[PDB]
Write an enzyme that holds these catalytic residues in place. Sequence first.
Site, PDB file in Angstrom:
ATOM      1  N   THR A  27       0.811  -1.209   0.000  1.00  0.00           N
ATOM      2  CA  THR A  27       0.000   0.000   0.000  1.00  0.00           C
ATOM      3  C   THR A  27       0.847   1.264   0.000  1.00  0.00           C
ATOM      4  O   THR A  27       1.645   1.491   0.910  1.00  0.00           O
ATOM      5  CB  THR A  27      -0.944   0.044   1.218  1.00  0.00           C
ATOM      6  OG1 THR A  27      -1.769  -1.128   1.230  1.00  0.00           O
ATOM      7  CG2 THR A  27      -1.823   1.281   1.169  1.00  0.00           C
ATOM      8  N   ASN A  28       0.673   2.081  -1.032  1.00  0.00           N
ATOM      9  CA  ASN A  28       1.273   3.405  -1.063  1.00  0.00           C
ATOM     10  C   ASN A  28       0.359   4.368  -0.320  1.00  0.00           C
ATOM     11  O   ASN A  28      -0.542   4.967  -0.909  1.00  0.00           O
ATOM     12  CB  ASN A  28       1.507   3.859  -2.500  1.00  0.00           C
ATOM     13  CG  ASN A  28       2.102   2.764  -3.361  1.00  0.00           C
ATOM     14  OD1 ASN A  28       1.730   1.597  -3.246  1.00  0.00           O
ATOM     15  ND2 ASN A  28       3.045   3.131  -4.217  1.00  0.00           N
ATOM     16  N   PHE A  29       0.597   4.506   0.979  1.00  0.00           N
ATOM     17  CA  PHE A  29      -0.366   5.127   1.880  1.00  0.00           C
ATOM     18  C   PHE A  29      -0.647   6.602   1.606  1.00  0.00           C
ATOM     19  O   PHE A  29       0.256   7.404   1.375  1.00  0.00           O
ATOM     20  CB  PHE A  29       0.094   4.968   3.330  1.00  0.00           C
ATOM     21  CG  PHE A  29      -0.893   5.495   4.332  1.00  0.00           C
ATOM     22  CD1 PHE A  29      -2.015   4.758   4.671  1.00  0.00           C
ATOM     23  CD2 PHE A  29      -0.704   6.732   4.927  1.00  0.00           C
ATOM     24  CE1 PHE A  29      -2.930   5.243   5.587  1.00  0.00           C
ATOM     25  CE2 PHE A  29      -1.614   7.221   5.844  1.00  0.00           C
ATOM     26  CZ  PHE A  29      -2.729   6.475   6.173  1.00  0.00           C
ATOM     27  N   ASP A  97       3.437   6.405  -7.078  1.00  0.00           N
ATOM     28  CA  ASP A  97       3.107   5.002  -6.850  1.00  0.00           C
ATOM     29  C   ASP A  97       4.086   4.026  -7.501  1.00  0.00           C
ATOM     30  O   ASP A  97       4.702   4.326  -8.521  1.00  0.00           O
ATOM     31  CB  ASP A  97       1.689   4.715  -7.346  1.00  0.00           C
ATOM     32  CG  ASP A  97       0.642   5.538  -6.624  1.00  0.00           C
ATOM     33  OD1 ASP A  97       0.872   5.900  -5.451  1.00  0.00           O
ATOM     34  OD2 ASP A  97      -0.413   5.827  -7.229  1.00  0.00           O
ATOM     35  N   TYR A  98       4.222   2.855  -6.882  1.00  0.00           N
ATOM     36  CA  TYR A  98       5.013   1.757  -7.425  1.00  0.00           C
ATOM     37  C   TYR A  98       4.181   0.478  -7.423  1.00  0.00           C
ATOM     38  O   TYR A  98       3.172   0.390  -6.726  1.00  0.00           O
ATOM     39  CB  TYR A  98       6.302   1.560  -6.624  1.00  0.00           C
ATOM     40  CG  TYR A  98       7.486   2.332  -7.163  1.00  0.00           C
ATOM     41  CD1 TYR A  98       8.256   1.821  -8.201  1.00  0.00           C
ATOM     42  CD2 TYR A  98       7.838   3.566  -6.633  1.00  0.00           C
ATOM     43  CE1 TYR A  98       9.340   2.518  -8.698  1.00  0.00           C
ATOM     44  CE2 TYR A  98       8.922   4.272  -7.124  1.00  0.00           C
ATOM     45  CZ  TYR A  98       9.670   3.743  -8.156  1.00  0.00           C
ATOM     46  OH  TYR A  98      10.749   4.440  -8.649  1.00  0.00           O
TER      47      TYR A  98
END
Length: 196
Positions: A27-29, A97-98
């Site tokens: 998760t990219n918070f 994002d990744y």
Amino acid sequence: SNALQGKRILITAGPTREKIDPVRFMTNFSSGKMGYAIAEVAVNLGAEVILVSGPTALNPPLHVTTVQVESAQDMLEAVIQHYQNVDVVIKTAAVADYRPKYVHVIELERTVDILKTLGEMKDKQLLIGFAAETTNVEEYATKKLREKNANMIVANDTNIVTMYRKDGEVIELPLLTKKEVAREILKQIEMMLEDD
């Protein structure tokens, strides 16, 4: 109450969810609180609001047209679907994002930049972005403002927010709640719509 009457505003909020395997994901918070707050205030100003949200614990405001997604790819597709029919796009995610390459030690691949994409296929829409840095705040926010072809970049440290507009103006704010910041943002957007 009618400041943004008839104005179509699209907002992205929350984190993105990228699968690793059928029972694992990263998760990219991003909280989502800011985006949901902007969406509520925008509705109260008479705007037509579309909210593209990642997985949050928040409930969308009334009259808000909300699309719940998970991956950054699905968020991209959702925004593109509405991009032609909106006046303003507000990306409330400072995090780039990744994404894992496989869905079954973990190879990461580059995801498609949402704000960069919108900037390249931009017509008359206004692009609002966010940024959160601990160093070179002005330089990074300005760089992102010009690189992504955006109209305003909101820089972060209750919140301490500095806004960077395309025309070169810089507006710093004191300690405000998220709803207060939301109002200041939508106030700035209201003016940019009059400039056109």
